[PDB]
Amino acid sequence: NPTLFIAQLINFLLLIFILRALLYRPVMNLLNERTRRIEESV
Amino acid sequence: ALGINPTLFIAQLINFLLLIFILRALLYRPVMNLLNERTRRI
Amino acid sequence: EALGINPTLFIAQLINFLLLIFILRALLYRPVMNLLNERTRRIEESV
Amino acid sequence: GINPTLFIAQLINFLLLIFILRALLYRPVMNLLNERTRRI
Amino acid sequence: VGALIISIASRFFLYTGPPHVEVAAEVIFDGIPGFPITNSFVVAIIIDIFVIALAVAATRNLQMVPRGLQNVMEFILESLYNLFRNINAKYVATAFPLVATIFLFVLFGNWFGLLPGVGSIGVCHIHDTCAAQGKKLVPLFRAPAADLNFTFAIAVISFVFIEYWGFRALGPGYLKKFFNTNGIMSFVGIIEFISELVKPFALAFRLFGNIFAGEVLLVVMAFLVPLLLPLPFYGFEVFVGFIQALIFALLTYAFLNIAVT
Amino acid sequence: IASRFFLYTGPPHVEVAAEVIFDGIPGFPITNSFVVAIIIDIFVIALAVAATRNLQMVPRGLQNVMEFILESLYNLFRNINAKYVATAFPLVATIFLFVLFGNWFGLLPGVGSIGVCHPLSSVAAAEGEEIHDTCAAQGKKLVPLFRAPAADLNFTFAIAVISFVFIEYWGFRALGPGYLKKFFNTNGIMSFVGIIEFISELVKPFALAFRLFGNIFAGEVLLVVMAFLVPLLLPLPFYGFEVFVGFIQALIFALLTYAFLNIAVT
Amino acid sequence: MEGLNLVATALAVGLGAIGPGVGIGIIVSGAVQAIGRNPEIENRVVTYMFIGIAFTEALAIFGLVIAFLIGFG
Amino acid sequence: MEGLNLVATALAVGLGAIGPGVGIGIIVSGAVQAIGRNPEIENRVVTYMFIGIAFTEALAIFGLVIAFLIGFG
Amino acid sequence: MEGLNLVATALAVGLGAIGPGVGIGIIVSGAVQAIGRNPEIENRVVTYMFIGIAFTEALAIFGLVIAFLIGF
Amino acid sequence: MEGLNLVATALAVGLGAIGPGVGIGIIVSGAVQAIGRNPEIENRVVTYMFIGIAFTEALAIFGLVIAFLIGF
Amino acid sequence: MEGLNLVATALAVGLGAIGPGVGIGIIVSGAVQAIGRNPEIENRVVTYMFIGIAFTEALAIFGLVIAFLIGFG
Amino acid sequence: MEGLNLVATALAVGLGAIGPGVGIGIIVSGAVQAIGRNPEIENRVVTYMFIGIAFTEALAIFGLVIAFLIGF
Amino acid sequence: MEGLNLVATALAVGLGAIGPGVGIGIIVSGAVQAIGRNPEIENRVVTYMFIGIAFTEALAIFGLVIAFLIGFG
Amino acid sequence: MEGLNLVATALAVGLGAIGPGVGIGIIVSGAVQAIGRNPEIENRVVTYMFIGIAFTEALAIFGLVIAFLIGF
Amino acid sequence: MEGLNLVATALAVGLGAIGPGVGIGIIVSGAVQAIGRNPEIENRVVTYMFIGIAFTEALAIFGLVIAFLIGFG
Amino acid sequence: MEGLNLVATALAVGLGAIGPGVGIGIIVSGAVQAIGRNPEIENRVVTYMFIGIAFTEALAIFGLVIAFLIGFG
């Protein structure tokens, strides 16, 4: 679509930016904590 | 309406079975073995 | 005269009012007089 | 029932009622109640 | 009295006919060149006379110990004073006469509606009496609260009273409430304002509709079975008249209380 | 912020349709749902081999996240029944991982915009745009090559029937002749409630398939409608809700499958 | 339509008998639960329950009166 | 259009049964809970429960009988 | 379309009975429960209980009044 | 029309399921909670619960027989 | 066809009354229970309960004024 | 007309879903709470809950049977 | 049809008072009960109560806007 | 007159959503509560809660199925 | 026969306000009641309360979207 | 008549919002109260609340999808 595709891309980019600003630090922190626990277990 | 295609239905069933087998063979058995090793030898 | 009277309605209303008064006397007469007497006794004793 | 003159007259009657009972049903009773409470 | 009552089928011998009583407004009692006398205004005057008579009879001697009618008169005022003191402390004296009058007057108006003959006795302007002649029948002794004009008048006088005694109590603050808050009392304030505006409407409508429903219920139960059927309804309505009177009084006092505070 | 919601460039309408049959030049015709399902299977297998080709202690990177999610799933299923937490884990894991990425694919731009075909143009004074699509010629419909796999009543039906078959087989695996004892046992009123139990057990896979298909299709339709209303700065909360609910329903499917397994075996 | 009168009477009955019934049930259940503890309050709680039941029956009989008026003009 | 009488009868009975059913349910639930809390007050509890049940059944009977009047002459 | 006014009256009265009826029931049940829990608080509770009773009945009376106006 | 009878019986059965259904649900929930609270009064509470169940089912049977008379 | 305005007014008033009545009922029940539990916080209790009942009555008044505009004008 | 039977069947099934649905919901909630409060009486409470569930669903079964009869 | 435009506004406002009315009622009841239980959490209680009230009022505002759009055209 | 089948399907699905939705809500609330005050009984309470949810969903699916049959 | 579109828009808006309104009311009442008994659990409970509020608002958005779709065809 | 499809769409979506709207609210309120009473058990409580919300929301989605099929079929 000449116009709907642009709107969908804009919405997807905005959602990705919002997730990176908000919902990216917590998942990375959880992964880092799991890795630290695994390292301690070894 | 429903779009119930018996040919597509059987194709989807076969694809799902193949995906289940592939997942069981890779990254399920191996990840399970790794978790067991990290848990039974921690 | 210019009096508008409904025979059945007037008699029915009189009968209903009389029966309501009878039931009030049978039930709602002892407590109303009793509370009056209690109030009177409490005020009279407060002298 | 939206006649202005009639509910105006009803308002007048109600105001007359309150201002006429202030001096006969309230003032004597209020004075008696005040004295009775003061009597105890 | 046994439950095997036979007189339940008196409608065959005593048929009241259709409930012709359906007027939602006033009917003139006496032809007067000036303002007309409504079927509600005459009973209002009668109730004023009754209230004056009871007041003068209960205050003619002013006996120290109340006995007979004096105690009866004192008890209701004592209960109302205790209730209002429970609601508000220092505003009992300021509003007690008005709230007590608005209680007693509408209580007697509500109780008058159940008097027999109210729906039967009337003046010519199954088939009643007047319909035999050429002149139609209009009823006599219509309840005051049944008239929308009287309920609107008492509602607007209550509104004026509460506004005046909120303004005098709270200075300029009550005049404009606290609309300048802009944080909370900017959208809540207008909602409270429209609630205040409709408050007299709701207050008048409560009494008017309750009394209208009462009278039409009495007429309907007379229509269905004019014997022993409207007894529980009569008891319910004499109860609910006093209940609505006390409701109106307590409600206007509470609205004054929430206004000042 | 409140002056940039221009509607001059947007879709002309809100296209709504069921699964559209793809061209299918050879035999055994395919649809737009099968191709995307295959590509998501390929992506899943690629991620699996990436987390598998390098397996070691102290996981880090993709392998760490994969192991964390897998152990969280094992913990969640263990909270229901530890007897079959591993015997049935691959099925629920595969279904969950497939449905999550299927719901995620619907958010990819071009879904409903790319067509295989087997300002001034926009209407003024209207909240919706009226810009004609690229395939508007030939009176076509601009068949979406990319569509959500779960938005089709065939993939959902297939996973529902395979889950029902797996659950029924695992229940019959160790139950003796106990299935019939629970259905219309003719013991007082237990027979009638057993009849309702049998009916509910029969209708469960249909309910699951219809629920997932409707959820994903409704998500895609609401996204299309919001795009039609305002092209941008409108649908951020709705896109976030859809991305949340897709993974939520994906985990729900596996959890319900395990729960039905436990309630059938017990 | 010619038969709207009967449907109107039915609606004024049935729709008028829903809320009052639930209110009566709630009132009676609350009164019984309250009298379960400290039964000495039975007189006052029964009085208040009767006030409530009168209000609910008030609404129900408003509905009944309207239905009777509609069914008979 | 003559089926409006049946429609009215059905609407009247159904909407006059839906309310009292919920009322009776709540009444019995509260009464049973109070009885479990205090078995000794069960006499008065059952009395008041029957009073409320009769009121709900009074409403239901009104709805049924007026539906009968609609259905018949 | 004769008889529409009757159906209007019926609907108005029915809903006005449904709503405030349940409101009154809930109010009275809560009041009696509180009184049973604490009898002493009755003198302060009954006032607000009746305030709420009046507030609930306002909508039912609105419905009845509108029904009467429609019928007349 | 020629189908208003079907609509009538359907509505009657539907509302007869609406009311007594919730009544039964609340009755059984309260009875079970009380039984779990005190098992010793189980006989009496079961008797009262069954009485209430019959009353709600009496209403349901009234509705269903009205529908049967309409349908048949 | 022609009486649709009357039905509109009736439905508006009835639906706008059915909800806020239950809302204010639950408001008053909760406020009464809280007052019985704690009389010292009564001032804030009353202020907040009156704010809420004002909100609900504002909704009911919106319904009533919409019905009035429908009936007249 | 033509769709009156369909409307009737749909309405009947819908109401027979809304009533018994809430009924069984309340039943199950109460039974689960009672079981949590008392594991020892589980057999009796489960039996009574199943009886109530059957009655509530018996109502819906009657509704569905009526709908199928109208449909058939 | 000549009518059906008054009926639309009527239904919209009526149901938009049905929903948010009960929502606000339950919100206020919970808030007053919590205040009675915990007095000094009043600030958070009032804040969350007002956020919930605004979220509920969003639906009533939508209904009123729809009714006005129908009325004005 | 247009096809009433659309209205029938709409009403059926809508009421099937109305009833079982509240049923599931109440069931889940009670199950979560019983788990909260007693985690030790979680297996049995979740089993019975799932039974109840299945019954509610059984009713809802019945409504959806009859709606689909009306539609086709 | 012709103005049915406005009726449909109104019905959609009204019922999509009916549902989520009560949902949000119950959610906020439960959240505030829980927060009253446990001050430090506010961070945990706020997330779930907002999730439920959004889901109810998701349903409301469904209703509003349908109303707009039938509002403009 | 003519535009019955929009009416059906509206009714389906509205009731689908009505039911699950209440269901989700009840679920969230119960879950929040349980979490507040016992903060340590939320590990399974949150998951159970979400899976319960699934079943409720499924019905709303059913209504929305049926309405979409009606409006576009």
Structure-block tokens of residue N54? 């299945």
Interatomic CA distance for residues F13 and A3, integer angstroms: 11
Contact yes or no for O58/P20 (Cβ under 8 A): no
Partner residue facing F222 (CB), from O54, O65, O72: O65
User: Distance (Å, rounded) from C-alpha L53 to C-alpha L26?
Assistant: 10
CA-closest candidate to residue M56, choices K24, O16, K57: O16
Token pair 């006989």: residue: J43
Distance from CA of J67 to the nearest CA of L (A): 9
| Dihedral sign of CA atoms E56, E60, E64, E69 in order | negative
Determine which of O29, O45, O69 to mutate to test the interface with M (most M C-beta atoms within 10 Å).
Answer: O29
Q: Report the run of H or E that residue F209 belongs to, with start and end.
A: helix F190-229
- Select from F78, O45, O22, O40 the least CA-distant residue to N36: O45
d(CA F102, CA H30): 50
For residues K9-18, b (16+ Cβ closer than 10 Å) or e, as one string?
A: bbbbbbbbbb
Question: Which residues of chain B does F59 touch, with a Cβ-Cβ cutoff of 8 Å?
Answer: 34
Between F and P, how many residue pairs show a Cβ–Cβ distance under 8 A? Answer: 40
Fold of O4-72: F1FO ATP Synthase (1.20.20)
Q: Is D2 on the interface with C (CB under 8 A)?
A: no
Query: Residue H72's CB: how many other CB atoms inside 10 A?
Result: 8
The DSSP 8-state label assigned to residue E139 in this structure reads E
Instruction: Tell me whether residues E124 and C4 touch, CB distance under 8 A.
Output: yes
Chain-centre distance of CA O59, in angstroms? 6
Q: Do G61 and E224 touch (CB under 8 A)?
A: no
Structure tokens at E113: 């509606």
The whole-angstrom distance between residue H44's C-alpha and the CA centroid of its chain comes to 21
Contact D25 E59 (CB under 8 A): yes
Q: How far is CA E244 from CA D1, E160, E249, K30, in A?
A: 22, 21, 9, 24
Q: For D16, phi and psi rounded to 5 degrees?
A: -60, -40
Residue type at position H51: I
Nearest by CB: E77 against D2, D6, D29: D29
Q: How far apart are CA E243 and CA F86, in angstroms?
A: 70
* Cβ–Cβ under 8 Å, residues H40 and J44: no
Does L have 3 or more CB contacts under 8 Å with G?
Answer: no
E148-170 vs E188-224: helix axis angle to the nearest 10?
A: 150
The half-sphere exposure of B21 on its side-chain side, counting CA atoms within 13 A, is 6
Counting CB pairs under 8 A, whether chains C and J reach 3 or more, is no
**Cα F263 from Cα F167, distance rounded (Å):** 10
Residue E249 token pair: 């009084």
Quick check: O13 and O62 in contact, CB under 8 A?
no
Name the residue of chain E whose CA is nearest to G73's CA.
Answer: E18
Q: How far apart are CA F124 and CA F140, in angstroms?
A: 25
Q: How far apart are CA E34 and CA E48, in angstroms?
A: 22
Q: What is the residue whose two structure tokens read 């105890």?
A: D40
Contact E105, D17 (CB under 8 A): yes
Nearest Cα neighbor of N45 from L38, D36, E126 is L38
Q: Are N45 and N35 in contact (CB under 8 A)?
A: yes
In O, minimum Cα distance to P8 occurs at: O8
Task: Tell me if L60 sits within 8 A of L20, measured CB to CB.
Answer: yes
The Cα–Cα gap between F169 and F261 comes to 10
Q: How far is CA E53 from CA E39, E59, E68, E76, L47, in A?
A: 22, 10, 15, 17, 71
CB burial of H3-30 (b: ≥16 within 10 Å; e: otherwise) equals: bbbbbbbbbbbbbbbbbbbbbbbbbbbb
Q: Strand pairing partners for E28?
A: E38
Place of tokens 């809500």: N25
Which of B2, B9, B30 faces F52 most closely, judged by CB atoms? B30
* Closest CB to F225 among O54, O58, O69: O69
Chain I partners within 8 Å of G49 (Cβ)? 28, 32
F214: nearest CA in chain B? B2
Q: Which CATH architecture has domain G4-71?
A: Up-down Bundle (1.20)
Structure tokens belonging to residue C47: 């002298």
Nearest to F57 by CA among L23, E204, O23, B37: B37
DSSP G40: G
Q: Which residues of F touch P50 (CB under 8 A)?
A: 248, 252
Contact F52 B26 (CB under 8 A): yes
The residues, ordered by sequence, that sit 6+ positions from K6 with a Cβ below 8 Å of its Cβ are I4, I5, I8, I70, K71
**K57, E198: Cβ pair inside 8 Å?**
yes
Distance from CA of F127 to the nearest CA of O (A): 9
Instruction: Return d(Cα N52, Cα N28) in angstroms, integer.
Output: 9
Instruction: Compute the distance between CA of residue N30 and CA of residue I72 in angstroms, rounded to an integer.
Output: 50
Which of F182, F187, F191, F196 to substitute to test the interface with L, most L CBs within 10 Å?
F196
Give chain E positions within 8 Å (CB) of K64: 198
Distance CA A8, CA A1 (A): 10
In whole angstroms, what is the distance from residue F78 CA to residue L60 CA?
36
Of O18, E193, K17, give the one whose Cα is nearest residue M62.
Answer: O18
Please name the residue that has the structure tokens 């508006």.
K12
| Alpha carbon distance P5, O66 (integer Å) | 12
For F156-191, give one letter per residue: b (16+ CB within 10 A) or e: bbbbbbbbbebbbebbeeeeeeeeeeebbeeeeebe
**Phi, psi angles (nearest 5°) of residue E20:** -65, -20
E122 forms beta bridges with: C4, E139
Question: DSSP assignment, residue F30?
Answer: -
Phi/psi class of residue F212: alpha, beta or left (left: φ > 0; alpha: ψ in -120 to 50)?
A: alpha
Mutate to test the interface with D, among E23, E32, E101 (most CBs of D within 10 A): E101
Are the C-beta atoms of B19 and F90 separated by less than 8 Å?
Answer: no
Helix, strand or coil, per DSSP, at residue E64: coil
F57 by DSSP, 3-state: which? coil
Chain K contact probe: residue of E186, E195, E199, E205 with most K CBs at under 10 A? E195
Residues 6 or more apart in contact with residue F89 via CB below 8 angstroms: B28, B32, F73, F74, F77
From chain J, the residues in CB contact with L62 under 8 A are 13, 16-17, 64
Are J3 and J53 within 8 A, CB to CB? Answer: no
Strand partners, F144: F115
Do K24 and M22 form a contact (C-beta atoms < 8 A)? no
Both structure tokens of I19: 């709503």
Residue carrying structure tokens 């989807």: B12
Q: Do A8 and F131 touch (CB under 8 A)?
A: no
Query: Which whole-number Å values give the CA distances from G22 to E98, H22, I27, K60, L67, in the listed order?
Result: 38, 6, 12, 21, 28
Minimal Cα distance from O21: which residue of P? P21
Tokens standing for residue N7: 């209205």
DSSP lists the bridge partners of residue F21 as F31
What 3-state class would DSSP assign to M71?
helix
CA–CA separation, J41 vs L34, rounded Å?
Answer: 15
Chain P residues whose CB is inside 8 A of the N3 CB are 4
Q: Whose structure tokens read 């642009």?
A: A6
Question: Is the CB of G52 less than 8 angstroms away from the CB of I9?
Answer: no
Q: Are O23 and P17 in contact (CB under 8 A)?
A: no
Q: CA of K1, closest CA in chain E: separation in Å?
A: 27
- For residue O28, the tally of other CB atoms under 10 A from its CB is 32
DSSP string, M13-34: HHHHHHHHHHHHHHHHHHHHHH
Residue found under tokens 């014997």: E227
Which of N33, N39, N56 is opposite residue P30, by nearest beta carbon? N33
Residue H73 Cα, gap to closest chain J Cα (Å): 16
Q: Does E217 touch chain D (CB under 8 A)?
A: no
**Per CATH, domain M6-72 is 2.40.50.1070:** no
Phi then psi for residue E123, to 5 deg, are: -115, 145
First to last CA, chain D: 52
d(CA E113, CA E47): 12
- Here the tokens at position L38 are 């008392």
Q: What spatial distance separates the first Cα and last Cα of chain C, rounded to whole Å? A: 57
* AA letter at F187: N
C-alpha separations of G33 from G28, H35, I53 in Å: 9, 9, 21
E115, E119, E125, E130: CA torsion to nearest 10: -120
Is the CB of residue H52 less than 8 Å from the CB of residue G28?
Answer: yes
Domain range enclosing C40: 7-45
Closest CB from G22, G32, G42 relative to H23: G22
Partners of P40 on chain O (C-beta within 8 Å) are none
What residue segments make up the domains of chain K, in order of their start? Answer: 4-71
Considering only CB atoms, which chain F residues are within 8 Å of P47? Answer: 76, 79, 255
First to last CA, chain K: 17
Contact M17 K55 (CB under 8 A): no
Q: CA gyration radius for chain H?
A: 17
Instruction: Using DSSP, state whether E124 is helix, strand or coil.
Output: strand
Residue spans of alpha helices (H) in chain G: 4-14, 19-36, 42-71
Q: Does E87 touch chain I (CB under 8 A)?
A: yes
Residue pairs between chains K and M whose CB atoms are closer than 8 Å:
158
Question: What chains are in contact with E, requiring at least 3 Cβ pairs below 8 Å?
Answer: C, D, G, I, K
Cα(K15)–Cα(M9) distance, integer angstroms: 12
